[PDB]
């Protein structure tokens, strides 16, 4: 029902749609019917998959971490031993979702998290342990865990989720930005200072997730990998940007490595070759 | 009669005429507007100092010489020393502004060359060292002079490769941002009207740059034989619909 | 208790499912939507914007000269450029069209190809921009080129030609990955008369090539891009 091309015959005219001036900064919406003779075709196509709700709205792996279940006797900090592990939530650590999101400078979405835990015993196990993971959403200002079993994991006001390893978690988080959107990019600082960090802002702060195994320990050591999957939903995006050409180097920075390979592919031949 | 290449822009007591122009760009088709009550969170009554700040401020002229990589300005930063607008920018905690950016480069009918004049909302710059290295405040805030993309890398400064747009994205893809061309056979001016583009309704004008103006030579400047191999590029920026909020003492920025 | 039977795929996490889930923050009231300019609803909006093609990708490094198609003065009948129309590869791979195309498997519809002339206003040229549809080779003598879809471009006060590459395909969709069955054909520019420069000017003048999509453009079956890659996870 939507027309793709219209029927157009031979034109011999002074109204020339295909000569324009791109110094104006505009793309003139020149049809194929404007410079060849066309037939009536129909679209049969709405465009529902290139919508930004569908584009940014499928689950991407955003974080992979290790926690362990072992005997915590004499371990000092319990964080280097990976008895727990917290993660400052961002969509910039793993670059596939990042290049999709850095196509805009402002994005606002409800978040959906799917947290998968897989276990592995790399040595000396008589059985596979049936473990429970606590994933505690820790907003900034909440007490961070220092032990795998301290008072912070009571989570009286922190949202927390328990799930078995091998099983997965799923919970949604609303848009928790301070601003009306998240800043994918921030040409600025937190304050006027000669040494403060550039670009890193709390305008894309989304909280933090602390992860521990609720089980005590066995004889053997269990390595539990936790994979966080983020699906954006109710996506609103603003200011389309140039796509990232160069490899990323850091979270929250537009930096690229020195001496990097050329991103434009060189031809085999001249500019005349096909 | 209705000449699309002859325009006049009057803002305040300042007027720019052009006779060799393209059509002006209004970024994302939004004209600048004041902050409405439905979007406002700050409860202060804002000051709207209309003719004294919403007027053209001509920057220092850049010389385009055949090997010029480009220039980058930061708004509101390139107007931080400009009249009453610069003073309200440092005496207030909050401020929002749209802009009419007008970039000027005249030549003859014998000259060739093309300038990408592009406005990039929140052009977060890349450090030239890579890693987690930050760009220092004084390099992201160079004022009227702007960033010369033909200059060398400095310690704490941004990367100045014009092909990667100082941010890791290719040069040809800047045309998704609201842009014009000063192609010397066609126009000598580029006019871009910028609205206030931010995820907050009003913002600090000293810690944050809303947009960047990049004037980038795409096709190199070819002068005719016997001409000086140099064209001046003059950038004239006017604030538009400028609010200021949260009046206190004058803030002290670095340098 | 309702008797239920549990089907295959129970407990699976398909990453493209769109279901409901419990909110970790009950009664949370998010920040209001203020008006931000430039709102994007659909990626078919922004690929209709023209972006520069790095069509002179004949250099060992990426620079501004990759975007500059050189013209030369005393040249009759010759070729200006040539390219195949695999829009997810080659000169198109890094353009905004070609980057969003690489998030999708199939494409359809017409391409908008622009050339901006940049030489002096007292210069002149006539060029012929040819689209060769598939099944034939890339044209080699301008006589082979004007047998296909072509625009003769007289260069004057309007510095930009807009050529369409019309959708010349038997199959309804083409792969964005280069596939030989579903190749789009070839694009080439040729000297239609020549480039005449004015006195006291010499050398090469340049063309700027642009690519965008016509409004009949289609994209489907979202997939990952081969553009960006990663070895270790990034940190702050």
């Amino acid at each position: 029902q939507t027309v793709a091309s219209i029927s157009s015959g031979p034109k011999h005219t002074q109204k020339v749609p295909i000569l324009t001036a791109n110094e104006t900064g505009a793309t003139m919406p020149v049809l194929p019917s404007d410079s060849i003779e066309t037939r009536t075709t129909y679209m049969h196509f709405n465009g529902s998959e290139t919508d930004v709700e569908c584009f940014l709205g499928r689950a991407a792996c955003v974080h992979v971490t290790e926690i362990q279940n072992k005997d915590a006797t004499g371990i000092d900090n319990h964080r280097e031993a990976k008895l727990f592990n917290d993660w400052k939530i961002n969509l910039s650590s793993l670059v596939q979702l990042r290049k999709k999101l850095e196509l805009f400078t402002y994005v606002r979405f409800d978040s959906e998290y799917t947290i998968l835990a897989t276990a592995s015993q790399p040595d000396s196990a008589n059985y596979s342990s049936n473990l429970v993971v606590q994933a505690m959403y820790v907003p900034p200002g909440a007490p961070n865990p220092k032990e795998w079993d301290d008072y912070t994991w009571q989570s009286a006001s922190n949202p927390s989720v328990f799930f078995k390893v091998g099983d997965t978690s799923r919970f949604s988080v609303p848009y928790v930005g301070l601003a009306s959107a998240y800043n994918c990019f921030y040409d600025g600082y937190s304050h006027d200072d000669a040494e403060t960090q550039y670009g890193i802002t709390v305008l894309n702060h989304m909280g933090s997730m602390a992860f521990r195994i609720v089980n005590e320990h066995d004889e053997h050591k269990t390595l539990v990998k936790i994979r966080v999957y983020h699906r954006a939903k109710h996506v609103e995006a603003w200011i389309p940007r140039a796509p990232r050409a160069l490899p990323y180097t850091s979270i929250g920075r537009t930096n690229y490595p020195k001496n990097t390979e050329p991103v434009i592919k060189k031809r085999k031949g001249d500019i005349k070759s096909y | 009669g209705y000449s699309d290449r002859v325009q006049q822009i009057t803002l305040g007591n300042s007027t720019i005429t052009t006779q060799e122009a393209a059509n002006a760009v209004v970024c994302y088709a939004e004209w600048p507007e004041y902050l409405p009550d439905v979007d406002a969170s700050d409860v202060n009554k804002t000051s709207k100092p209309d003719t004294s700040v919403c007027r053209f401020y001509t920057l220092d002229s850049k010389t385009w010489t055949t090997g010029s990589k480009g220039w980058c300005w930061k708004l509101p930063d390139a107007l931080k020393d400009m009249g009453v607008f610069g003073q309200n920018m440092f005496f207030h905690s909050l401020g929002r502004s749209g802009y009419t950016v007008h970039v000027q480069c005249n030549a003859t009918k014998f000259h060739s060359g093309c300038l990408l004049v592009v406005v990039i909302p929140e052009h977060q710059l890349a450090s030239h060292e890579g890693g987690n290295v930050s760009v220092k405040y004084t390099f992201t805030h160079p004022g009227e002079r702007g960033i010369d993309l033909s200059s060398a890398n400095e310690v704490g400064g941004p990367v100045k490769d014009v092909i990667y747009n100082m941010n890791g994205t290719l040069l040809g893809n800047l045309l998704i941002f609201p842009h014009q061309f000063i192609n010397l056979r066609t126009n000598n001016t580029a006019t871009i009207v910028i609205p206030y583009i931010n995820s907050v309704p009003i913002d600090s004008m000293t810690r944050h740059n809303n947009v960047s103006l990049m004037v980038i030579p795409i096709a190199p400047l070819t002068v005719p034989t016997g001409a000086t191999p140099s064209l001046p590029i003059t950038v004239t920026i006017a604030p538009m619909c400028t609010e200021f909020s949260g009046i206190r003492s004058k803030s002290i920025v670095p340098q | 208790g309702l008797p239920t039977t549990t089907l295959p795929g129970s407990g699976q996490f398909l990453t493209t499912d769109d279901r409901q889930s419990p909110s970790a923050l009950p009664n949370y009231e998010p920040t209001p939507r203020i008006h931000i300019p430039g709102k994007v609803h659909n990626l078919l909006e922004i690929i209709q914007v023209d972006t520069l093609i790095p069509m002179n990708n004949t250099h060992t490094k990426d620079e501004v000269n990759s975007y500059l198609i050189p013209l030369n003065a005393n040249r009759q009948n010759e070729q200006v450029f040539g390219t195949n129309l695999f829009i997810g590869d080659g000169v198109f791979k890094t353009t905004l069209l070609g980057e969003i195309v690489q998030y999708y498997t199939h494409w359809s519809g017409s391409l908008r190809f622009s050339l901006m002339y940049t030489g002096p206003a007292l210069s002149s040229a006539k060029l012929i921009l040819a689209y060769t549809p598939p099944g034939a080779r890339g044209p080699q003598d301008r006589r082979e080129a004007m047998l296909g879809t072509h625009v003769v471009w007289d260069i004057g006060l309007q510095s930009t030609i807009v050529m369409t590459i019309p959708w010349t395909s038997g199959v309804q969709f083409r792969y964005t990955d280069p596939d030989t069955y579903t190749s789009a054909g070839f694009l080439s520019c040729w000297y239609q008369t020549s480039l005449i420069l004015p006195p006291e000017t010499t050398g090469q003048v340049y063309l700027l090539s642009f690519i965008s999509a016509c409004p009949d453009f289609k994209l489907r079956l979202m997939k990952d891009t081969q553009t960006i890659s990663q070895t270790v996870a990034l940190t702050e």
Partner: antibody
Amino acid sequence: AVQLAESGPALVAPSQALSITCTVAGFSLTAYGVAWVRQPPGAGLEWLGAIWAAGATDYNAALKSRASIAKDNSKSQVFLAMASLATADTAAYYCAREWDAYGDYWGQGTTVTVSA
Amino acid sequence: DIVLTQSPAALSAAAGATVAATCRASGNIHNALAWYQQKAGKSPQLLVYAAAALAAGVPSRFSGSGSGTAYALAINSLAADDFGAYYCQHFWSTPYTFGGGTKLEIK
């Protein structure tokens, strides 16, 4: 394999007409230009001229009124012709192929000595 | 017409050393400049086209640099293969004039 074979008389009296052929293999003259460059022994390279990929010729600004370049597309041959030979024309005459508009794929050349 | 000034006429050097030949131009070449090497009794061989980009099979110790009117061919860690006359030619705006040439003698 791109090959350009120069073929001349290699010994010619002065005040005569010179003629070098550049036999072309591996490409067509309709698609690539051919440049001519000489080198007298000891002295450096001098660009003689170029015939472009369709017929149009550009010449050395000193030698334009005596040099002439033609070609034959169907025979894949390029014809450098020189008139009124001086003893400064004693050189190794090379032919090239247009390579991104630069000169490349140089032949072995022909030593052409102008003497009596 | 553009006249290329190539400097110097000769440099006597040894292997491992670093050699820079410089080509100046009367007019702006816009990087449309080529570098040729030539061994004794051989055809000239294009090393660096477009004033910075190495040609096919040219080893990675040659490096062209410069823009505008000043162009410099630098050799980092010169080897035994790298001896002979070197030439600069511009390919901006026919006539495509050469430089004067630069010899390299074994020290």
